[PDB]
């Protein structure tokens, strides 16, 4: 069976549970050439619906990244050399004679390198031949508070290629832009970004081999104080259902049982009043759920943040979300099946186990128990209903996109962009001049708005753009002059893009782009000198 790397996976959208992929082999040389160049995996790093990166390192690599970047980790000489080498793996990839390292962050009385020092060491040993060092400041995923009230990790900040402060997570390297891997793709070019993704991959792998990481049981349990907190909160939520329902129908809490039941009977023969009732009921229940989740899950649970190996995987963004640990550890909440809530049978007892016309939240699709402790039968049936609804919807939906992608290629068949830079249909007609001014096709236009990023380093980007060869053949002064004339607030001047196409005249940009660069120069003049 073939073998691929984790990274590409999120693109092909496979779970590798045993699904299978066509492997092809273009025979001739024209075909394999154009394939190897246009479509080499790294050269498809930005999914083209938006700009954000679609590749990335994943679950084990990311939580072990949160365990390696963390400041509590120290390595000696032996482990540091070994780990750096396992990350690089030069010979098979090639390109290098001898590896260069950094000095130890702390030296006496024992020489102990730190982890971020190793991420910096990798970033160094993949430095291009002569490109100035990276610098970046951008917010991380794991909020700092989990570490400490007013902890400094928070946001990854590394100038000149050294992780000064800030741990790596999903956002730093993964399916999130403006992190490490994306800015490395920008500065150092994509054929380096791929090698970097691979290097971080093997690195966290070798680390996992050194250290190990498991999702063990005690991660789930509430401490006795926490669990009795939750039991008190539900003892208070003993009744919320009756109160909310009697309030929606309008009768008092001490109401006569007969009139209460008669009203309820009047309620769900009609169906719109049921939508009102369920809106109000789910409102009160979502309130209760917010309350108990908010007190319990971050503080109640047995292990703290870092030493806990599940809160790690959840808040780091590897797999799951906060709702997952909520369900596993505190309560499940309301089960909303196809919108509103549980369906009633004719006699109004949502389940044959509950008395007719039930007002307790227990029969409104709200379930008190938590997965660790074990859910009861009554509630279990509702959960089954909701889960099964999920499946029969996700199954029967995938035929809805079953006619639109045979619709949107009859009418967007060719729609190629000719060398007049004016997207035409194949027949010859004009559809969009300059592609909505385009700034590109979205797959690269992303870093324009990151106007701080370029001015931050600026020494590597100029070499990337290769100014000495480009400024030669292309016209610069004339269109840059006319840009101001077009920015003249009165009209009779076209947008500069219409007058001077953006191919050869190195002076045309859309209005908002020049407005952005100008109002940035005047708005944030801190980096630019004077």
């Amino acid at each position: 069976t073939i073998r691929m790397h984790y990274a590409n996976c999120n693109s092909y959208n496979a779970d590798f549970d045993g699904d299978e992929m066509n492997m092809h082999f273009p025979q001739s040389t024209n075909a394999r050439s154009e394939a190897q160049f246009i479509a080499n995996t790294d050269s498809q790093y930005l999914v083209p619906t938006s700009g954000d990166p679609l590749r990335g390192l994943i679950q084990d690599h990311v939580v072990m990244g949160v365990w390696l970047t963390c400041k509590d980790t120290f390595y000696t000489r032996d482990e540091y050399q070994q780990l750096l080498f396992q990350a690089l793996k030069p010979d098979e990839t090639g390109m290098y004679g001898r590896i260069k390292t950094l000095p130890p962050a702390i030296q006496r009385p024992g020489i102990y390198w730190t982890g971020k020092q190793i991420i910096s060491s990798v970033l160094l040993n993949l430095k291009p031949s002569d490109r100035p060092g990276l610098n970046l400041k951008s917010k991380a995923k794991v909020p700092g508070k989990y570490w400490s009230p007013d902890s400094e990790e928070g946001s990854v900040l590394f100038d000149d290629g050294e992780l000064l402060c800030g741990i790596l997570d999903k956002s730093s390297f993964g399916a999130s832009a403006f992190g490490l891997v994306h800015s490395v793709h920008e500065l150092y070019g994509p054929d380096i970004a791929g090698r970097l993704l691979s290097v971080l991959s093997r690195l966290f792998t070798a680390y996992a081999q050194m250290r190990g990481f498991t999702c063990r049981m005690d991660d789930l349990r509430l401490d006795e104080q926490g669990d009795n907190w939750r039991r008190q909160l539900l003892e208070n939520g003993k009744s919320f259902g009756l109160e909310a329902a009697s309030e929606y129908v309008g009768l008092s809490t001490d109401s006569p049982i007969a009139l209460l039941n008669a009203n309820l009977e009047e309620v769900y023969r009609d169906d719109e009043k049921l939508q009102g009732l369920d809106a109000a009921m789910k409102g009160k229940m979502n309130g209760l759920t917010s309350s108990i989740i908010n007190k319990c899950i971050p503080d109640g649970l047995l292990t703290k943040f870092p030493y806990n190996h599940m809160q790690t995987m959840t808040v780091s963004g590897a797999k799951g979300s906060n709702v997952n640990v909520s369900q596993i550890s505190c309560l499940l909440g309301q089960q909303e099946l196809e919108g509103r809530r549980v369906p009633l049978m004719v006699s109004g007892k949502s389940l044959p186990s509950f008395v007719p016309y039930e007002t307790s939240a227990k029969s409104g699709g709200f379930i008190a128990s938590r997965f660790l402790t074990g859910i009861a039968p009554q509630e279990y049936y509702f959960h089954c209903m909701a889960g099964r609804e999920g499946l029969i919807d996700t199954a029967v939906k995938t035929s809805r996109s079953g006619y639109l992608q045979r619709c949107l290629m009859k009418h967007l068949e060719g729609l190629c962009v000719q060398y007049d830079h004016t997207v035409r249909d194949s027949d010859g007609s004009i559809v969009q001049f300059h592609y909505g001014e385009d700034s590109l096709d979205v797959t690269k236009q992303k870093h324009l708005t990151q106007f701080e990023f370029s001015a931050k380093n600026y020494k590597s980007l100029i070499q990337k753009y290769k100014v000495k060869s480009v400024l030669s053949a292309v016209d610069s002064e004339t269109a840059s002059s006319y840009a101001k004339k077009a920015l003249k607030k009165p009209y009779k001047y076209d947008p500069v893009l219409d007058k001077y196409p953006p191919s050869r005249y190195l002076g045309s940009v859309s209005e908002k782009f020049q407005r952005a660069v100008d109002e940035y120069t005047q708005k944030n003049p801190d980096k630019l000198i004077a």
């Binding site: 007609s429 004009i430 559809v431 385009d438 947008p495 893009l497 908002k512």
Partner: protein, 207 residues
């Protein structure tokens, strides 16, 4: 009660506004008219007393191109066959190139074919009242439209090596076309203000 006297007040801010927008010139107060400004302009015994004097004209700032325009309102509902064709010789002695008409309601179809045939080199254009009484070009969902000289059309046809059958179109039932005074064949220059990157200028024709 008496709101109908507002309907025709709001019929000069859809007409005196419908000037340039074609290239003409009109006094800059006939656009900023207050409500009672008009009642002071057009007076009578009533208090109904609005008709019989709602007609003006304008001379172009193009200063050429043969010729000018003249605005006249036939307020009487169902204009018919006796108020469409009789108001043509009055255009003819005035040497006015194209004029307007409003009506509520229903310019009769029998008085809808026989009219545009005699106009020949002139053309009545075009509207009815009670439909275009709020300026269309004034909103966030509509760009500013501009015509093009034959030189200005030649500009496009050259810089793109096009045929007038390859550029996008606008139908004539379109309010912006009938609003601009477009004829079938001239290119209008539209200003796509989409806040993605600046705002560019596209073009279209009519046919």
């Amino acid at each position: 009660e008496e709101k109908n006297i507002v309907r025709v007040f709001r019929a000069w801010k859809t007409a005196h506004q419908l000037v340039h927008d074609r290239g003409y010139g009109v006094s800059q107060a006939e656009l900023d008219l207050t409500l009672d400004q008009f009642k002071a302009m057009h007076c009578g015994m009533g208090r109904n007393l609005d008709r019989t004097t709602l007609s003006f004209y304008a001379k172009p700032s193009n200063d050429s191109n043969k010729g000018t325009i003249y605005i006249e309102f036939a307020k009487e509902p169902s204009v018919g066959i006796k108020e469409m064709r009789t108001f043509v010789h009055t255009l003819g002695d005035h040497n006015h190139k194209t004029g307007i008409l409003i009506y509520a309601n229903s310019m009769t179809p029998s008085a809808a074919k026989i009219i545009a045939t005699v106009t020949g080199q002139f053309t009545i254009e075009t509207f009815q009242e009670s439909d275009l009484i709020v300026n269309i070009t004034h909103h966030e969902l509509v760009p500013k439209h501009i015509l093009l000289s034959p030189d200005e059309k030649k500009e496009l046809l050259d810089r793109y090596k096009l045929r007038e059958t390859q550029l996008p179109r606008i139908q004539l039932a379109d309010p912006v076309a009938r609003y601009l005074g477009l004829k079938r064949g001239e290119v209008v220059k539209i200003v796509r203000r989409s806040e993605t990157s600046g705002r560019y200028n596209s073009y279209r024709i009519c046919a």
